[PDB]
């Protein structure tokens, strides 16, 4: 049947819920964004220049038994900002637990 995903609200400006990526699941908070179509989270391989990565959860493919390598570069440009990295494949859990 339907799957409830509870969201937090920060200051009426950010709404986000917990998902899992990997086996076992590594938990991340995400915006469920009806204005775009890609999923991404920070990598443990993020560049040292990426200050945001210092204080967010990071995905470690080495700890997931369902990870499948891709490695293709991607770049996404939103109205509020941009990012880049590389693609990977894994099982996504909603909610995380």
């Amino acid at each position: 049947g339907p799957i409830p995903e509870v969201l937090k609200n920060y200051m009426d400006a950010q709404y986000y819920g917990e998902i899992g990526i990997g086996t076992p699941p590594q938990c991340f908070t995400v915006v469920f964004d009806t204005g775009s179509s890609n999923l991404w989270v920070p990598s443990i391989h993020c560049k040292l220049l990426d200050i945001a990565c210092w204080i967010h959860h990071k995905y470690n493919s080495d700890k997931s038994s369902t990870y499948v390598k891709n490695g293709t570069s991607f770049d996404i440009h939103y109205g509020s900002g941009s990012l880049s990295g590389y693609l990977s494949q894994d099982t996504v859990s909603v909610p995380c637990q």
Binding site: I21, A52, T66, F74, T91, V94
Partner: protein
């Protein structure tokens, strides 16, 4: 819960600027159509549909507009949640399957100013906090309510004036969706101070995608929203209040 197998996703390694630094969330899970997926990656909900992990290929949002309320919101995958809306759903067809784009009939400030006078296109975007419209039309709107410019297309209103502002009504599918001044203004806090942000922001989105209005969290907060991929439509009902 649900486990979507074989999902392709981005491992971010560069995040220039400041957007993501102080954000409460780690990442973004896009729920629009595959047409606007970067690298043509099959989206999460598309993969979910192909794996038959829900019976109805719809998903729905409740967003609380009291910033201290628990729960903050709920995304329901594969259904709607009667806990969070009253009355019946009204539907609008999607017009370009890329964003969740629909036709907007008009925008009316109660004191008389009409924007989008002969109709226009809008997207329904959970990932935008504010309502967004064209710079020149939003400027007129803000002058009508007595708001003043802040920066980058945002405007502020003296908090003591909010309760006497006019209502603003969006006409969608021939029905009126009213926003009260409390619905379309937000409290913002920095360094122990409180201000009131106008919930409309001016931004010109160029062709070919634009121009587009954006029904952001301001709207979805008041109007519980259903996104339906079986029938390519958006549904609205009055959220619990």
């Amino acid at each position: 819960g649900v486990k979507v197998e074989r999902q392709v996703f981005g491992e971010a390694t560069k995040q220039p600027g400041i957007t993501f630094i102080a954000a409460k969330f780690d990442g973004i899970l896009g729920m629009a159509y595959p047409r606007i997926s970067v690298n043509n990656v099959l989206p999460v909900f598309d993969n979910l549909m192909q794996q038959k992990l829900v019976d109805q290929n719809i998903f729905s949002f409740y967003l609380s507009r009291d910033p201290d309320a628990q729960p903050g919101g709920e995304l329901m995958l594969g259904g709607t949640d009667s806990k969070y809306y009253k009355g019946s759903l009204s539907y609008l067809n999607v017009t370009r399957k890329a964003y969740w784009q629909v036709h907007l009939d008009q925008v009316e400030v109660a004191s008389g100013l009409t924007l989008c006078k002969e109709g226009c296109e809008a997207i329904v975007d959970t990932g935008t906090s504010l309502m967004v419209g064209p710079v020149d039309e939003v400027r007129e709107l803000q002058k009508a309510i007595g708001a003043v410019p802040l920066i980058q297309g945002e405007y502020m209103i003296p908090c003591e004036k909010v309760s006497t502002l006019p209502a603003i009504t969006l006409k969608l599918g021939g029905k009126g969706y009213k926003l009260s001044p409390e619905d379309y203004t937000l409290k913002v806090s920095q360094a122990g101070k409180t201000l009131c942000l106008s919930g409309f922001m001016g931004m010109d989105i160029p062709p070919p995608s634009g121009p587009l209005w954006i029904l952001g969290d301001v709207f979805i907060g008041r109007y519980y929203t259903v996104f339906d991929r079986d029938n390519n439509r958006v549904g609205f009902a009055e959220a619990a209040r």
